[PDB]
Design a protein around this ligand. Sequence first.
Ligand code: PRO
Ligand code: PRO
Length: 290
Amino acid sequence: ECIENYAKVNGIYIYYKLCKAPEEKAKLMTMHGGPGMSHDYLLSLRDMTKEGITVLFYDQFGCGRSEEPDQSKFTIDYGVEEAEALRSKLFGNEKVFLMGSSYGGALALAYAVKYQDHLKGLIVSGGLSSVPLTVKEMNRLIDELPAKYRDAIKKYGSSGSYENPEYQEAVNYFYHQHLLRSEDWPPEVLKSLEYAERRNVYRIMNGPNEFTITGTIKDWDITDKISAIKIPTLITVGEYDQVTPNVARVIHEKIAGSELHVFRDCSHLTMWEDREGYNKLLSDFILKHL
Ligand code: PRO
Ligand code: PRO
């Protein structure tokens, strides 16, 4: 049982769950993917507390339990100013370890470029610095899928017929291959997905699905700026992650001293596929740069 509460940031209420660590050695701020999902599917990281690591979970604007601002503010740039404000409001000047998953990773990167002075380390899992690149890679993944699912994605996708059952099949197949490779997904994940579909952030900023980025982040690309990051950076990417290792490499190539860890048999939600290993490597990294 962690403490849950509402924080008023930039004129709106943001829900956050703080799981303090007994003999806390450091704090970890987390950023969920999407955009438009929730912190829920990241709960697995809570195990970090037993390692003396406090973990801050929170639903970004318009996500999960938080309220949406003006649509004109559905941007990554705003998401950054939201993270800082929360950081500043919840912890003050105390520096912290920022972690970002998927979109949260791209968001985390944008944050570091501006407020790395408030960070001690950066952990990017399945993240990205360029949306277009992430898109071209996924396309390769699609063409690598069974003909039926590949032609169903191109056929029904070019028409916006995402409701199509066949299209749906191709989507879930893709997910059970590059999003999460396991029989039954944990409730935590299903809720984040449930949230993305309930709120309006995922529909506007991201688009129809994971491999269909028609949202307002279509052209985003700060690969040319992530180079200014100097803090201890840890990058992870599933072997079959929807955001391919090539996307993780481009990042790891711009951040000197960064580490790249490709988890075998894992995909996107590596924190669930390999909970132990994931939580381990992340805590090891942190406990190395206090
Ligand atoms: O977490 C997400 O939704 C981003 C955008 C699609 C690929 N990964
Ligand atoms: O139906 C889909 O594929 C989208 C993907 C995120 C959750 N719902």
